[PDB]
Amino acid sequence: GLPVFITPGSGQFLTTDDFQSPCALPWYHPTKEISIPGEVKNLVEICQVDSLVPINNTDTYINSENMYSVVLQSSINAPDKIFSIRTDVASQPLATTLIGEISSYFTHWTGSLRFSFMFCGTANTTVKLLLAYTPPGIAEPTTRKDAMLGTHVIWDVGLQSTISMVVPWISASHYRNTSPGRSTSGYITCWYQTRLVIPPQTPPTARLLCFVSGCKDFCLRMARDTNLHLQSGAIAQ
Amino acid sequence: GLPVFITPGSGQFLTTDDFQSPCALPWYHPTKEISIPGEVKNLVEICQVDSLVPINNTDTYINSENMYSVVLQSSINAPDKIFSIRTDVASQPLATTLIGEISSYFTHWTGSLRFSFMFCGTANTTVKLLLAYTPPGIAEPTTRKDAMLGTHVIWDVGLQSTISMVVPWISASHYRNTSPGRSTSGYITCWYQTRLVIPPQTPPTARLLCFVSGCKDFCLRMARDTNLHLQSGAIAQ
Amino acid sequence: GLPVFITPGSGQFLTTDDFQSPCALPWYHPTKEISIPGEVKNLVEICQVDSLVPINNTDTYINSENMYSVVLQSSINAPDKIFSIRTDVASQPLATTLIGEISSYFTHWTGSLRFSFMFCGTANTTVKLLLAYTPPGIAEPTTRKDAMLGTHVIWDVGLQSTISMVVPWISASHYRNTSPGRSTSGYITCWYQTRLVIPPQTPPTARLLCFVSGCKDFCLRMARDTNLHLQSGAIAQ
Amino acid sequence: ENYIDEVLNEVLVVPNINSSNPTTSNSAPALDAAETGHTSSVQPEDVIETRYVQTSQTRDEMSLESFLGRSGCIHESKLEVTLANYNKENFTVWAINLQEMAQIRRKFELFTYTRFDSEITLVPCISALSQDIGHITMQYMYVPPGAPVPNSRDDYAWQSGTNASVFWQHGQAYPRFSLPFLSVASAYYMFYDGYDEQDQNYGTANTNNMGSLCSRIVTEKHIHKVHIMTRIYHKAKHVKAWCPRPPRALEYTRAHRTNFKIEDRSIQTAIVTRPIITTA
Amino acid sequence: ENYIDEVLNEVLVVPNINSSNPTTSNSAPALDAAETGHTSSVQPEDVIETRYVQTSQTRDEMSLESFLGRSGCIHESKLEVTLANYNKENFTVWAINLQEMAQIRRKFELFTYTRFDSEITLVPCISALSQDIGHITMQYMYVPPGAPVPNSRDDYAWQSGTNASVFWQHGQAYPRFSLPFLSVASAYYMFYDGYDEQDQNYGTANTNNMGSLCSRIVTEKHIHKVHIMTRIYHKAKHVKAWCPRPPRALEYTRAHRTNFKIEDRSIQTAIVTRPIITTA
Amino acid sequence: ENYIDEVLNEVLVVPNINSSNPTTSNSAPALDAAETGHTSSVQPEDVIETRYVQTSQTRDEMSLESFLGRSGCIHESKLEVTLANYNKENFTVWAINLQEMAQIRRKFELFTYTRFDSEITLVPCISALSQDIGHITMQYMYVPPGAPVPNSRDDYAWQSGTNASVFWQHGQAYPRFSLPFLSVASAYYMFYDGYDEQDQNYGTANTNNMGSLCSRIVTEKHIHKVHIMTRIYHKAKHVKAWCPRPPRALEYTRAHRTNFKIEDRSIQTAIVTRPIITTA
Amino acid sequence: LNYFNINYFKDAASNGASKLEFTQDPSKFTDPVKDV
Amino acid sequence: LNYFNINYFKDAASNGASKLEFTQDPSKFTDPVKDV
Amino acid sequence: LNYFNINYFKDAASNGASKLEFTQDPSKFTDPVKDV
Amino acid sequence: DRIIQITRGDSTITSQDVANAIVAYGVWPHYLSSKDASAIDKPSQPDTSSNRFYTLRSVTWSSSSKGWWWKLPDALKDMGIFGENMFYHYLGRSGYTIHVQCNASKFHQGTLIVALIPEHQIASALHGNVNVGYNYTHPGETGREVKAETRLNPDLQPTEEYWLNFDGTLLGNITIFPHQFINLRSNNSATIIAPYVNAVPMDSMRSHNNWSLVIIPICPLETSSAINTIPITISISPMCAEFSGARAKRQ
């Protein structure tokens, strides 16, 4: 018998270990793999797909589909805010989205985010909007001037419905926390660059949709259980 | 003493393990092997031998030898059913047979089955029968037309008593369950293609025997205890 | 610390194991071997030496030296039995002998046995005896004819006192049990081929001695504790 | 060269950000149509003047193997041991599902189909209800569909002639063993849009039927009342999965069904309401 | 190249199904005579137009080694420990058979002759009948035919001078050891069509007599009443078998005899009756 | 080529039986004189017409190493623990002999001289006489001739500064250790035809004096009455022996003496009487 | 430096966690492009 | 990949489960053919 | 196949059971022959 | 090509309708080799005086007959030199050619199963602690008829349950044993050649029967003919028969 010496940790069940273990079904030969389309190798494949942000989370629109669109008015000639969003990604509203829910399965955050916007108004309706990400260490911008001084994209609605802008990863440290709580990653704020113009006899109001995905940039680390789902009771057999 | 670290599972008795173990009879030299005919290396060798199916399982024929034959009548001119069988192999009636009993020692099922039929009537008696396997997702065929639309063999009794037909493995998935219970593997149904014809002064009724084996096709996996045998009391010393 | 996994049997004391173990007297250098005549390497060396069989085990001769000889008479002209013996080797009477006692330390039996006989009568006395081994599946032979139909040696007393005959290993299976109890290995039976003839004025009765050893043939296996010795009380310090 | 590169956890790397310059052109990469069903191709360097940064970050941890490869509880079986001739009772039976505990269920339900070998790990605990405990040994036997199901602490089926059983006794460390991927098809179904032959039981109910995990206390009749609670843990090893689906938004009602509705309770997502959309 | 090919469990393969075509000929492969005692040679491709399918399936698990190579219970020995000077009693004796527990018995009785080495595994459990247990050590000694059989917890034979004994004490893990194939002939007999020298005791009784397994509690007189139940488990290693027989159809009555008849009970196979044969 | 040939246990082989033919000659191999002290040379083929048989049998198991190389009990030391200030008592002392237990004694007494290394294995068992046990640790010290012999559970000699001691505590597995062949001469004497300088103490008493095995309970004064029975087991390793003697025919009376006579009991061998010699 | 790994068991499934191999998309989620 | 195996014991029987070798019939159950 | 053996200890006696070497009589028990 | 002629001794058998023939377990009978042997004496091999066709007393097949069996070497107990060689030695070994013969008309129908089963250890008739008595498994050439009657000494009798193969196993799995079917419309003879088979090189011809021949009709014999009852005849020839350990004759 070989002299051997036992070490701290032995006997212990650690959830995240990987060790070998006798197979209970020896000699069993598993079914052929076959070809199924759409294999996922890596979670980031999902974070990289456009998901719709529940931008309108008011108590009034909550459980409808209208939570997913914002409304623009021809009634307004003005530098008015339309909406704003915390940019951290496990944050509300964006936590519900693909990239959020997944980020919510990790404790660490980094990359650039791709916000794309689709204008759903009449083919003959036109507007120019300002889309702005204001970096952290300051308050959510209260005016068009204040917002525009940051990173922005002026969007002109025309033949192509859509535009994508990006919030660069700009941060003190290489990674960020998915549940920061006090610290912010910045804001993204939408304004009227001109006005929503309409012809005769066409709807005065038009909607706007909002999407997020990650860039090549994006990465998550330190896997943790998700905060966006729970089990209250017991589950029926 | 070498530093070493103990792993989950240790101490455990697992029935299906194979590890080494000191021999309690060291130096003992076992008796010569010698030649005995009929070695079996692999269980499938048995599944490949024709066994007789207890095709007539009525309460009336049960514990006799007559459970093993079916009776044909010259009295009938008609497209009549003679008998039918669930085709799953751990199923009744075929569970009792070689291939069944063995399949009953595993939980998984695949291959083609070879059903052979021997006509035991007078040398001068003649008939033509239809033998049909109707694949799953439909009900046991109620009429000759309905049955014949599936995989079949029209059998003509003549000098050679016997015919073998086969139920191809035709199934959604590569393997099936030996105890499916709700799901079926299909049916095999025997009918009169013509009529049982007889000369003067020869018995009006003739019997029919039925056999199963597996084809080169056949395989079983995931060994489990058998359902076709039990121990109620205790066994005498 | 190296990941390692504990196996069924561990912790156990098995009498027949051989494993290493720390020496409690490290560095100790044992005394020179020297030459002593008569080393034994293997137990069979002993089984191969002639031992005297206690052929006369009657209650009347028991604890004497006379248990070891048989008596021949000039008074008899006849095909009379002289004595007989069970041939199994752990059997009575031969269990007491070298080869028996040792066979009694194993559970398995095989080989040929060498029975040698020494005639102790007067130099001028003469006889011819029949020595017979009757193989199993039949009863101990009751008559000279019955005995002689088996394997035999007709022995003629003359200048050389002794003769050796052998019971061939003849058996169903390669080995036999040293404690068979119901099954027999056969018998060995001694008869008068002629008569014990004497001159004038010489003792009318003469003795006969009987020996056993094993042949090159012989082997024992599966070591077990002996049945020919016990410990009733305790042994004094 | 892959014993090294994965010891500091660096195979699978994230691209660098390149420097970028003032653009003036007819090429509008920021402008696409999301109507196509295609996610935009724009990268930071396309819409803003960026610097060169060498990105050291790693996707290893985000791999399917990292994510499913942690064990979590899939079942809790309580054995309340009675002494009413002790043999009529005192056994668990559990039909085997990844579906009765929400945390791991949500994770695998991120995909439509999944395939993998399994590491089952056991954590038995004896709650002592008498002055003492004594010697408790337990048996866990896997009883695949069709195998004889034990009806008493008694019955022959614990002989486990061909079944796999694993034994635990008080003081022994947590049992563990591995399973090979067990489905009859090429992958496990996390969702099923179909019914049985009888046109009933919508859903996963139909697909993966692994049979049952049966527990029994094996130590013979004795005097101490105890409870034994063995918790079952499951790690996925060697994993592939296909067809990502959106993540479960609501509490789980029932196994093998997507039913979300609950009695006399408002239907409640994890989204959180705001007073007004111009303020974050 | 066989460390690899058996790690994914692929030596021993199943043939492919070839494509097949409309046949018109005097060659009737479907037509044979089963009177010959020969099983038919027909294959799917012979009687039906088949496609080409590459069969990945494996017979490994169906090998004699896989099938007999799982341990199952062959004996249960209960030791009720008394204190009536404690030394007059308190030992098991068991004559060694694969014949007293039905599950493994049925399996090996699938063949006429069998040959193999054995792995015996022990599962002792102390049922505590007093307030406590204390220190229980047990001894198990193999006592081959002819060896002195212990008559008391006392007697010298537990000295085990040349016999093999194995010790267990509470808290130690399940003992295990291996045996070499022990018969005196070339294989073990599962059935025997003959009697003893005395023309008595039909059957296996005659053939394999392994002697006995003897158990004793070795801890000296003490105060706690307990029961010790050691269950014996047996795996076959290194196996060959010959002459397959049909499988046992009925419950087992007695060891070493094929007797099936039982008192005041109908003789009951595992076949199941139908109402009528034109309906499945 | 000897890692292999001894794994199936085949070095040391038995000769084949050759074919033999009808003999007619002046050469009488069956005829010898056993008066010479020589065992006969006759072989089966000499006195009977034999066939050719290839003998596969093996003498390995019959080797001196196989036969002595199994451990068996040589001593049983009971320690009854008192609490009468606990330190005045509670120690074993045993003078070391292979001579106090009959089973191994008979085996080695098959030879006149023997030589070998020893493996001592311990099987301690605590018989609990109180409601409980607590923590029992034991010490076993080898005290060679001349070393100070402990007179109390107390005394300094358990310091064991140069002596070898081995410790056991409840729950620890069976202690074991090896000894090198310890005699002062070239072999151990199983028998001695001589006396001491004083012309007294006939026999083995004189020869092998190994000193003594001393046991003590080391756990300090406590409340539970217990008994500890440590049984000593001995395997011979690396063995040679010389000059075989006939095996002991009668029960053993006393150690170190061949005395067989017992008081008021008939002197009883293992031979068994017959009614008459013409019947077996 | 680097690290040592052997498989101690006869069956595939006993083996520990698999090694990682590159994302190698193809872009089939983000861009399944019929005319590229 | 593949796997490592050594025998740690002196006796045949101690060794673990045997390796598999081909069915290699001959057809002696299904076709023991006197004229083939 | 065959089997692996190393000695783990510094002293002769610690080593396990010895290997077997041939009977090689000489016939000194059965035939110690002064004229052969 | 449905013809067969087998010549064994001074004996030659002929059948004009046969189904091939079967060689048990795919091995032809042989004499016992030097490698496998145990008994070290020179075997006696009677050759033509022993390995020849011995044909036993015939049995009658009727509308009611539910089966029969014989045991080997037992059935040959009283047959010629093979018989005598059987009781003069402890040990013997032999293979056999078994030829079962039943003929009828093209106007009869019936079907027999002819099986040769190794170590056929039958079952006691009743429950509890019974066994089967030596005499009842050693009928000689006459064999056991399955009879519905009450019998002499029932605690010693074997079961009459033939569909249980007498062994407590399902008839109709009776196939994994070497067998043929005699089916009147098709054949006339059944023929089986068997090698010695046993876990030992030679055994006792007296106390152990290596084989049992069992024929039970699985298709009842039906006819409109005047002869509604026909005989089945068994002839079996030992092959490569050898004996050893000779002594006097056991009775």
Ligand SMILES: CCOc1noc2cc(OCCC3CCN(c4ccc(C)nn4)CC3)ccc12
């Ligand atoms: C003697 C020990 O036996 C066992 N104790 O605990 C055990 C646990 C076992 O299952 C292994 C993991 C499986 C669970 C089945 N499962 C699925 C399948 C389909 C769906 C829709 N959801 N989940 C996929 C993987 C198997 C055996 C034992």
Ligand SMILES: CCOc1noc2cc(OCCC3CCN(c4ccc(C)nn4)CC3)ccc12
């Ligand atoms: C110190 C430990 O001693 C033992 N404890 O438990 C043990 C179990 C043992 O048997 C090993 C397996 C054997 C059983 C005998 N057996 C047969 C033989 C013939 C028939 C007809 N049926 N079964 C074949 C294999 C041997 C020794 C011990």
Ligand SMILES: CCOc1noc2cc(OCCC3CCN(c4ccc(C)nn4)CC3)ccc12
């Ligand atoms: C700290 C442990 O110390 C010990 N515990 O148990 C022990 C046992 C020991 O003896 C080893 C075997 C010896 C016994 C002496 N013996 C003889 C010698 C002559 C005769 C005529 N008969 N037998 C030869 C071999 C030595 C030390 C300890």
